RNA sequence: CCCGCAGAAGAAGCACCGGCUAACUCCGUGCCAGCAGCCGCGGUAAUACGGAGGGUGCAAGCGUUAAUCGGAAUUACUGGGCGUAAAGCGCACGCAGGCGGUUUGUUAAGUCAGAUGUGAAAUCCCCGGGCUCAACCUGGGAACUGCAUCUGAUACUGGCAAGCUUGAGUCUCGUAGAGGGGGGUAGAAUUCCAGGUGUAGCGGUGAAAUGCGUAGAGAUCUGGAGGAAUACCGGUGGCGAAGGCGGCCCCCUGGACGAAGACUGACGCUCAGGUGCGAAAGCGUGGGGAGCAAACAGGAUUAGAUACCCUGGUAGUCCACGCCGUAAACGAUGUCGACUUGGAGGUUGUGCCCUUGAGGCGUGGCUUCCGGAGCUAACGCGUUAAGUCGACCGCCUGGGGAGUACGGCCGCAAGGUUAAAACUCAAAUGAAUUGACGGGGGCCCGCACAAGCGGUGGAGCAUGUGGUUUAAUUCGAUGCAACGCGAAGAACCUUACCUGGUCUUGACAUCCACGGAAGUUUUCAGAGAUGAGAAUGUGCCUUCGGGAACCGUGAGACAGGUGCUGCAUGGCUGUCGUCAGCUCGUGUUGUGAAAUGUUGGGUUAAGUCCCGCAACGAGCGCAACCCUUAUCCUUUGUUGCCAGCGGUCCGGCCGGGAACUCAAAGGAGACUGCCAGUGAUAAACUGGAGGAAGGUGGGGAUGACGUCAAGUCAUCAUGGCCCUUACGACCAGGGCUACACACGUGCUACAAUGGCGCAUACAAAGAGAAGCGACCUCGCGAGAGCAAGCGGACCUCAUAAAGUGCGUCGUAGUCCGGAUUGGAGUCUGCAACUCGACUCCAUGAAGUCGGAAUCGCUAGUAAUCGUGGAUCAGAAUGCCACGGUGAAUAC
């Protein structure tokens, strides 16, 4: 949250450009992976996922603090740990944006 | 057994000297023991005021002294009269008139020596070292000090083969010249042998 | 049993107190004494030994030893095991024995319910009761887990009778197969032997020799004789109970698998003992004998080499018939059977669709690797289990002793088989983790090697160490990481040692008393320490009968020690190593020791950087921030400077100037910032550009966690212990410098890109007041006399040397080399003998480029030249700094 703000109006250039550059990458580096959680805070209430294997680290973790998961397991994966096992395909794209599109609907109602 | 005196190579970069005066080849040595003579004086007489460093400056051949200690009162007693007894004795073995100025150490548990001091007494009176050691470390840690590293040599605990403990917190960048790292020893010569204390404190930033 | 009398009065110990296991300190002793059930204590600071205090427990007892059970689920019926820990027979047929599919009837053995008798009493248990309670006695009940009989119940099990088909087995038909025995047989090679040819080697080894060959080998061709083995096919292929089984052909013969049916109708599963089989080596009788080859022979290798290597070579292996019966006879996994998610091959039958085209879809046998649940100590097993059960057998019960002895059985024999005990040790094992190591592997680095340059070791000399001698040749360091080291400097001093002379509350400190200033000056005996004297001063505050100073005597607490212990310490140091690593938190995996992170693809000087990845972060490190060197700018211009101009005794000597050198503070500048290529669009490497400098520009400081119980108790501090009319103190002379020896570290050499003389050029940095010391003067010179000047960009040290030019020298032990000695002198300093430095003259050795072995160095470095400094009165070729000249080589 530091870097993300500093780079565009805040603290980004009180140093040498290439050196001040290094923090920029860290900002993107932080943006690249951790970016999607910034807002989250605390801990989840649900952990929808697209696959079970490719993210096998989720199930063994998410089902460890109990956060309810929602997994589209291919006919290749292992549903064991997943809460609401949804048969389907991971390896597609028109299918997955349907799933997202499927979840996209009622998530838009929940807000209340 | 090879690290340079961390206060050493910082003289001029950060740390100002403990003596500030001038001389020439004739008297330079002559000055050294005398000012060492007063250092020998106060160090013996002022355990109980918790002295950290004494600053010597020779102005126009009329010595000036500063006492870096915890209790500006307890060195002077009441009305400050007591230090007058301390003022003139100083000059005598020095040779020139002396006004003896004094500086109160604000974060008592932050100067190395005083911290290293406290350890000695607690360790000097048969009290468990770790119960104080890590208590000592944790102390200035939350009083605000980026890093602390104490180290005790000796035959700790009334042992029979010597070894060394230590401890570390925060940062103690002993290669960064830019840093401020207070440092002092204050050995402990208890009933059983002599045991040492080294403390590194990254008190400052530049 | 009851009552009265007397008084606190007649009555408290034993073990242990390190963990086990309740309860600890002190002293004594020093691997002694001793303790002890176990594990273990005892090396001068023992909670464990002996005493002491105190504590803990139990109590008229307490402990010790002995004995049984427990703990021990280490004999496991309850309630153990067997892939590797102890342990599945090597394998098979199979009698006794155990166990047995499914249906109905029956019987009533087992089983089961009720009853009956007997199950002696006391004892054990339950409610009581009786001795004041208790123990003890005792009433009544329960129980005495049982046995026999009567009466039944009939599920399950058994007997018996009758079935049934899944289990099991027979037949019909094919299919594959190194299954087994016998009897032929073919090609290739091996050696042999006879001919032809033809000629000096052949064979062999790390390199050789043994051996074979001019009575002609080896080579090549032709041919014959033999013996044993079957290339290629050949394959984590096949076949067999297991051992094991391989060219082709034929005869004899076992097992397996599949089809659609047929048929008996539980005929089963296993099995101590028993019978049979059963690699290799070996035994016996008799055949064979090419190759291989125990044993042995010879040659080598080695320190030795009854081996590893080489040339040969007997038995043996090969065949027949007997024998032996053991093997890591090992998927280290008993046999039979049921069941329990998948994936991919292989091999061999068979059904169907399209063989419509190497196919596609089923259904069976056997087999190979990886894997899930689950299981196991983990490692791994995983539908062919080590999973889930059931039947039967074998086998285990610490290690060694010992698979042995004894006896039995077997054997021609070697031996096999069945198989103890005493005694002895508290361990022996298994799997797995972290490191370390490897004459294991891969990758990467450093003057580590290689390529060069120059030294070492040979010589003399200076210096340090071992050895040796000594009155003493102090003490310490003494693999790299001691050895020109502590020592940045021993004639005296230093000095710690030696002989002799002496002192002892003292040479140095605090504290007490008196006489008395402190100090000043001076003689004799004496090596000196001291002893014995002779004069002068009488001084600061007045409590003033004294101060406070300072000298002496006197008294005692003490003082003093460079005395032993760096293995009781602190502090400081070397070092692996400027090596790039070392760790932690949080989370995850694992029962756990731990792991991951920190690995990997690349990349770098670097766990530096990017990416990926059960990791995300962090600390200490690397780098950076500090010094200095390289280019440039702003201020200032002296004691330093001299450009353009005046004067010039042309020399910054004088005005004078403020540009340049330079001096010094403060800024700039190098960041892979720009360009191209290569590269995973990444980091990054490569080359160019500008630039003084280009890839951490050069050099330095800064040395991680730890290792070495590495140094040092003598710099210092220091617990201990230690000595104290001395291991402490003061003095003189001596040693620390000794010299049959040996080593390390340097200096100068052996010469001609060099020595010598004359002329002559260019440096840096530094040092200076009981100091550095011009000018001038005398001496061959070392230096002496006088002596401005400078605590210092101004004075002095101070004259750089190699260089350069000119003449000279002629390969010599020479004008090389300069030691050793001779006399003769100078300075320092009380003092130059032991033992200084330098100068004059004479003297002129060894030595001619140095064995094995060996060290340093990657550019202004090596090499070579000279200068200053510290240490110090005096004393460098040692150490530390400075500038000059100026390379070779890295594939």
Swiss-Prot record, chain A:
Positions carrying N6-succinyllysine: 1
Designated name of the protein: Small ribosomal subunit protein uS2
Span within the parent record: 115 to 226 of 241
Assigned protein family: Belongs to the universal ribosomal protein uS2 family.
Record note on quaternary structure: Part of the 30S ribosomal subunit, contacts bS1. Some nascent polypeptide chains are able to cross-link to this protein in situ. In collided ribosomes contacts ribosome rescue factor SmrB.
Cited function: Required for ribosomal protein bS1 (rpsA) to bind to the 30S subunit.
Organism field: Escherichia coli (strain K12)
Swiss-Prot record, chain B:
Entry's Gene Ontology molecular function annotations: mRNA binding; rRNA binding; structural constituent of ribosome
Pfam families, alphabetized: KH_2 (PF07650), Ribosomal_S3_C (PF00189)
UniProt keyword terms in alphabetical order: Ribonucleoprotein, Ribosomal protein, RNA-binding, rRNA-binding
UniProt GO cellular component terms: cytoplasm; cytosol; cytosolic small ribosomal subunit
Domain KH type-2: 38-106
InterPro entries: KH_dom (IPR004087), KH_dom-like_a/b (IPR015946), KH_dom_type_2 (IPR004044), KH_sf_prok-type (IPR009019), Ribosomal_S3_C_sf (IPR036419), Ribosomal_uS3_bac-typ (IPR005704), Ribosomal_uS3_C (IPR001351), Ribosomal_uS3_CS (IPR018280)
SUPFAM superfamilies attached to this UniProt entry: Prokaryotic type KH domain (KH-domain type II), Ribosomal protein S3 C-terminal domain
Superkingdom as given in the UniProt entry: Bacteria
GO biological process entries: cytoplasmic translation; ribosomal small subunit assembly
Keyword rRNA-binding set for record: yes
Similarity annotation: Belongs to the universal ribosomal protein uS3 family.
Role this protein plays: Binds the lower part of the 30S subunit head. Binds mRNA in the 70S ribosome, positioning it for translation. Plays a role in mRNA unwinding by the ribosome, possibly by forming part of a processivity clamp.
HAMAP family noted in UniProt: Ribosomal_uS3_B
Quaternary structure note: Part of the 30S ribosomal subunit. Forms a tight complex with proteins uS10 and uS14. With proteins uS4 and uS5 encircles the mRNA as it enters the ribosome, which may play a role in mRNA helicase processivity. Some nascent polypeptide chains are able to cross-link to this protein in situ. In collided ribosomes contacts ribosome rescue factor SmrB.
Protein name: Small ribosomal subunit protein uS3
Source organism phylogeny: Bacteria, Pseudomonadati, Pseudomonadota, Gammaproteobacteria, Enterobacterales
């Amino acid at each position: 949250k530091d870097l993300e703000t500093q780079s565009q109006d805040g603290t980004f250039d009180k140093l040498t450009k290439k050196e001040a550059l290094m923090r920029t990458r860290e900002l993107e580096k932080l943006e690249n992976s951790l970016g999607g959680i910034k807002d989250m805070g605390g801990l989840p209430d649900a952990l929808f996922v697209i696959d079970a294997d490719h993210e096998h680290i989720a199930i063994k973790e998410a089902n460890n603090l109990g956060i309810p998961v929602f997994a589209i397991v291919d006919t290749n994966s292992d549903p064991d740990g997943v809460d609401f096992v949804i048969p389907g395909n991971d390896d597609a794209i028109r299918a997955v944006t349907l799933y997202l599109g499927a979840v996209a609907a009622t998530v838009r109602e929940g807000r209340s | 057994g090879q690290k340079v005196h961390p206060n050493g190579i910082r003289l001029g970069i950060v740390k100002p000297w403990n003596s500030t005066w001038f001389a020439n080849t004739k008297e330079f040595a002559d000055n050294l023991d005398s000012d060492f003579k007063v250092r020998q004086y106060l160090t013996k007489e002022l355990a109980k005021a918790s002295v950290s460093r004494i600053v010597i400056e020779r102005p126009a051949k009329s010595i000036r002294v500063t006492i870096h200690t915890a209790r500006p009162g307890i060195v002077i007693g009441k009305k400050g009269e007591d230090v007058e007894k301390l003022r003139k004795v100083v000059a005598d073995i020095a040779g020139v008139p002396a006004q003896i100025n004094i500086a109160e150490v604000r974060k008592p548990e932050l100067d190395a020596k005083l911290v290293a001091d406290s350890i000695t007494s607690q360790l000097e009176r048969r009290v468990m070292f770790r119960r104080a050691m890590k208590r000592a470390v944790q102390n200035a840690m939350r009083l605000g000090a980026k890093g602390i590293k104490v180290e005790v040599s000796g035959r700790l605990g009334g042992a029979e083969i010597a070894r060394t403990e230590w401890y570390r917190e925060g940062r103690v960048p002993l290669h960064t010249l830019r840093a401020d790292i207070d440092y002092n020893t204050s050995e402990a010569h208890t009933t059983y042998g002599v045991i040492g204390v080294k403390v590194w404190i990254f008190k400052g930033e530049i």
